[PDB]
Design an enzyme around this catalytic site. Sequence first.
Site, short mmCIF file in Angstrom:
data_model
loop_
_atom_site.label_atom_id
_atom_site.label_comp_id
_atom_site.label_asym_id
_atom_site.label_seq_id
_atom_site.Cartn_x
_atom_site.Cartn_y
_atom_site.Cartn_z
N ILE A 157 -3.31 -4.65 -3.62
CA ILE A 157 -1.80 -4.90 -3.28
C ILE A 157 -1.72 -6.27 -2.44
O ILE A 157 -1.55 -6.35 -0.94
CB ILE A 157 -1.37 -3.55 -2.46
CG1 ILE A 157 -1.57 -2.38 -3.77
CG2 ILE A 157 -0.10 -3.29 -2.97
CD1 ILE A 157 -1.73 -1.43 -3.15
N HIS A 158 -1.76 -7.30 -3.50
CA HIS A 158 -1.38 -8.55 -2.48
C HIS A 158 0.39 -9.01 -2.67
O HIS A 158 1.04 -7.89 -3.11
CB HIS A 158 -2.10 -9.75 -3.09
CG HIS A 158 -1.44 -9.64 -4.44
ND1 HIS A 158 -0.93 -10.87 -4.46
CD2 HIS A 158 -2.71 -9.44 -5.18
CE1 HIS A 158 -0.91 -10.67 -6.03
NE2 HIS A 158 -1.84 -9.85 -6.43
#
Lengths: 167, 168, 166, 168, 167, 166, 86, 86, 88, 88, 87, 87
Positions: free
Chosen positions: H12-13
């Site tokens: 989750i960037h």
Amino acid sequence: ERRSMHGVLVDIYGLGVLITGDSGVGKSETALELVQRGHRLIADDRVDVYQQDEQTIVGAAPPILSHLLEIRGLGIIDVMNLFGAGAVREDTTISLIVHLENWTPDEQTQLIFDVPVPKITVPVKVGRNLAIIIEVAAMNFRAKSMGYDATKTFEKNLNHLIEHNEE
Amino acid sequence: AERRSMHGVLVDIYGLGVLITGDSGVGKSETALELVQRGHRLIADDRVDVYQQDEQTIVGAAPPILSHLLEIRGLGIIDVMNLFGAGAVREDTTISLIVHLENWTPDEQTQLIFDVPVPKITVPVKVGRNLAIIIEVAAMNFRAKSMGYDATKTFEKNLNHLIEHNEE
Amino acid sequence: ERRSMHGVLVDIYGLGVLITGDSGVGKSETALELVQRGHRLIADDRVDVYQQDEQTIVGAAPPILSHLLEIRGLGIIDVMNLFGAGAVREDTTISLIVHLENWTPGEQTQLIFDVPVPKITVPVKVGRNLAIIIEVAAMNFRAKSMGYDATKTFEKNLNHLIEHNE
Amino acid sequence: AERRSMHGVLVDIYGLGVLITGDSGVGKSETALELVQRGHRLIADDRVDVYQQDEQTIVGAAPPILSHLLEIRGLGIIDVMNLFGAGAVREDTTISLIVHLENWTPDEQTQLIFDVPVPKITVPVKVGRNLAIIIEVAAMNFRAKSMGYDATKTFEKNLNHLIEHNEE
Amino acid sequence: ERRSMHGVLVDIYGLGVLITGDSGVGKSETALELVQRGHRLIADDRVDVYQQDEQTIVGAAPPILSHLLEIRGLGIIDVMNLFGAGAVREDTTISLIVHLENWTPDEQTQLIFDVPVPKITVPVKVGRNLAIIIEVAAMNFRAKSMGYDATKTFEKNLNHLIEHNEE
Amino acid sequence: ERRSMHGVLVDIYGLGVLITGDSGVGKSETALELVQRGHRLIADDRVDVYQQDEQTIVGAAPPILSHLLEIRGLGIIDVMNLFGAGAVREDTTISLIVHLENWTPGEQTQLIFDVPVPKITVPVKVGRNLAIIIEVAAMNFRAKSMGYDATKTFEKNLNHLIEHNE
Amino acid sequence: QKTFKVTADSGIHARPATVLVQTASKYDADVNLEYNGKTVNLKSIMGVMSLGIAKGAEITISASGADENDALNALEETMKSERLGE
Amino acid sequence: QKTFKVTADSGIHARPATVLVQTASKYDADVNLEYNGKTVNLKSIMGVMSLGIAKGAEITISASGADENDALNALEETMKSERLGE
Amino acid sequence: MAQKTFKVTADSGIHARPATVLVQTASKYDADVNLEYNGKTVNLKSIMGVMSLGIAKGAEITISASGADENDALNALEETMKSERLGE
Amino acid sequence: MAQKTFKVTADSGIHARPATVLVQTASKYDADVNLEYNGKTVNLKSIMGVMSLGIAKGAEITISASGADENDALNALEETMKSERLGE
Amino acid sequence: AQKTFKVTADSGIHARPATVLVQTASKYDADVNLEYNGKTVNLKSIMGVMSLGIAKGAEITISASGADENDALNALEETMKSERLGE
Amino acid sequence: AQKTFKVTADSGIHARPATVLVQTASKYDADVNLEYNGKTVNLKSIMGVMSLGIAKGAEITISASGADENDALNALEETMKSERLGE
Ligand SMILES: [Ca+2]
Ligand SMILES: [Ca+2]
Ligand SMILES: [Ca+2]
Ligand SMILES: [Ca+2]
Ligand SMILES: [Ca+2]
Ligand SMILES: [Ca+2]
């Protein structure tokens, strides 16, 4: 071509101002006070200049000195590190030269690669705040460009007063 | 609890206790006055009562009789707490740096206070220099070096790379 | 009847402050730094004064010099043009006199036009920021008017302190 | 030499021509007023006359009749050249950034001016926000990215290192 | 131990001040204005705290967020890079908490690891300059430490006035 | 005879400026920001005024409120104690009235004690920095006194411009 | 004027540049240092170090003024004294 | 409350954290995200990205308020929609 | 795409007052209102721009609007143009 | 290492005025002049420090100096101490 | 201790001449003054001198008080002639 | 449109009571005022209310002008009793 000059190049109110003067006059310290007031340091001590056109000159700092200021007593300081990006600038065309002469009781121009750069000489004397005077010198220079010449206007007003006083 | 009185002005600059020393007449008070205007804290003027707090710490303060006061040649005594408010004073502070003002002449220092090596720097008093600005930056630079940013050490490193390089 | 005096008249914190001192001491430059700090320039170099009340003196600049400052090296500058309306004022009653005497090894007043004006003398010496001291001189003067006299309070405290029975 | 008139306020912030756009009533003028006080230059208020100077440059200016003026709801017309001096104005400037003020609502942009893609950012007008400060930093940050310091790109790089790492 | 909290931790006049409040209230923007006024940013958005003593708490920013501020519209900015060393600080003990509540017509304390930290709640309402109020809240907090409590002094003066008005 | 008015009286650039407006508009907070910018607080919330000349009104703070500001959330603060003498003033003649009206879809004066005081109304609306506008309102007022009326000058220029023979 | 062949193994860095300008500074005369076309003020250390003079470099020290010679002598004396070159 | 197994190969960037908070923000309720003991506000992106959630991570999204469920549904819908996890 | 044209009869032209009423009317609608005169066009909801045009007697101006109020805004603008005897 | 001791007779003690004359005399020499009273010692060339000591009647102070003027400074200080009837 | 002159230079005592007059005076410890129509100014400060607006035919009075008192006046008078200003 | 009360609470109308009085008033669109010894203040701003220094036995007059004019006074009177302040 590319020659190096002794002085401090700061961006004051958008104008490239080269501060010259005998070592010991405090060029760096004054420059330090100018970045605090919100101006940009281009090059300290050694200013590498080169002619761009036949009307403009450009100065910059050798990479090794980039962002640095040497202040007697403190040593070397990095203004980019102490004040951030708003304190530096890669380079700038030189518009005005203010030479700090050491005061002793007993227009103008200076050539840099065959381009005559306007110059003014301010006396270093106890009580004078050099950073403030140089800052105003730039400020006034800019105003004259915008069409507001206090001197020319005064001399005009003075002659009318003299011619008038002849009764 | 052993105390000694030192001659100088102790100001809190950027959180750092900075003791300004120097011969009477050098303008210690006037410079301190300009520092409180720039937003720094005055701890003690002229007489700074210090006491060692431990093996590596020196604390300074002003004798109650001088608290909040500054004596400025010509003006007399002024109360900075009264002219600038609470933001201009502080009861005390550990002394981190010593900036000695020597009057300039043509022709890693450390000072001992109670058997504690306090760092010191000496700046020359010379026409055109704005002393308040230099001391303020001295503190500012001192703090930066604490945070890990040493301009000098970094430059000397860069100079050797350059030399080594020009050596072909 | 107007009398011309040599000095710089600035409005500092509402107080008319006349700065006197030998030519060359830097009266104009200090005044320049005072307008930048937010004070008002009334008259530079030549201050035309005239008595009014038995205790009031008013100063102003001859029209020809209005708004101007002559700074060694730069020449003549118009502070109204470089800093705007907030930097000038047509005139002001003179409340304090700060004489800048070149440094060399209490209550005091100079009478301009036969009316006692409070005066203080500050030494011009390397390292001193004159604009800051004059500004505080006005600031302190004002405080004493409001009833806060640091000197009188200290001498009182010193006396109570000196009462050392021990 | 073809010209067009745009609605907004053009100010010189840190050397960068910044055109502030947004629906009338959003307070473009008031924000510009606060920017000149902070030391920036007012080029044109309300009506900005622009003309393409070449394939990648747009220049703006104020029609002579509006030069130096600001209209502030309640106060009327003010002349900043007269209230703040020469340091508050500038005849013109190339437009580098566009900061559009959209009024906030619960439920790499670029704008075209004369066939030239000027960069743009949109900041929300919402209670408590000091618009002058955000626009000033927007210019400041824009300039920094030009100098080679892109906080976003650097962070995204650092985030991937972190992720890759926590992935054991 | 170590828990993370939502807010912005700034060093204001030497005091660690944790600014809390619903997302969208503008915590970051206010913090941005505080560093410009000369204060120190410790941590933005995520503040990692841990108890040092039984009377003091310390906060800091996770390395990944160090020096950063996320401002709606602009994105991420590095204040260390835009304002220099004088704008940041590795950490600080938390002295005061100012919670920004969203204003609607219709002492104090907050616990962080069983240590009660003093808190004040200021209303976010049109026209209010939040940075200025928080700055003064810290300023006033400090003054009360120095022994100057404006409230306590006023209430004392008020009672004398009431007791007096009884004629 | 003293009459109490609701508002905040500050000395801005030497001009007594009375800030009025419904409670909750943030009069005190704006006043707080004005003293930080270097102006003087005369009276907060309750301003006791009394007529003097046929055109002069003077205001002051009841002793009990002297130097104080009540700021929602913080409580009572003493600006004399937080900012020093330069932040307060015993009293001042009222020159301008700036009424802060909450925003909702020329010459004007309000008469305090039977004497016409110039008034201006600025809208409180998101994004507006009230302290800055009031400060400039005083600044502009002062400029018009010095003879610089931007409005009158513009309307003149507009008229000359409108003279479009073409 | 007077030229030198730099022999210092470390080149003219931190400490050396320091003593060099320290010596030059003692003279009312003007003094310059050149290295590969570039010329700096020998009385200001930043400039001297910026040249990055390495071992084997050929520098030229020049002075102008009454002090002219005394300046050169002492600079030569320091080049030697400090074992910088010859 | 509702848990997920992160499947996104990138973790989750930047972008993902963006759509996640964007969806959570749409709800008057309170919403949190936890990863290895640490809990952040899901409505503020800096915090979410600071967690550095990688592929294979086990995160827990929780909400409090009337919106509680609708909040969860949409967050689950976005975890899936964005192909982040399940 | 609603538009309307007029010819000012205002012997005084569109100075301050007349500009004001024009924008105060244009301001009661969400529609975007524009005013063009001599090639240049300004936003009719902001007075500085309107006055900057310096519209004189005999000028031929074009008022345009876009959106919901579109027509409703033009109708009101045409009545003010009539009501204030500004032209056509 | 020149030193001298006195006993103040000043019924008023060493307040402002007497402090002033003391430092104005100490200030005419390059020698470093010190004044000790009750364990603490201050620099006799700076008035704030001298007055801070709050020297009262009956106090026993010690004036010391170091350098060229050393003796010459002490002699002058002893005469002012006499001249102003400050003590011993 | 003083000296009077009548200005003969056509274009009066304006900018240039004034800087040469004050330039001169400044060189002396004594403080010197210029008098025109009863109003007196410091001849060491140029703004004041030019403010007087001394025209052709004017009768000015230069005075000096100080050690070099006399050297001052002679120097000034010399400038008065040397600079074609008056007599 | 108004309502009078005589203060019965011993310790007068000080800090606490005042915030509960103004707290109340603030809830109404109408603007209400407090009168004590001829001097009037805004009952929606606490500094003014406390500045009056209303003591036990004082006779105050609360007035309101506005739509909720009446709801205001009732609400206030209720606080006057509910808060043991007066009658
Ligand atoms: Ca240097
Ligand atoms: Ca002193
Ligand atoms: Ca001058
Ligand atoms: Ca506008
Ligand atoms: Ca944020
Ligand atoms: Ca209030």
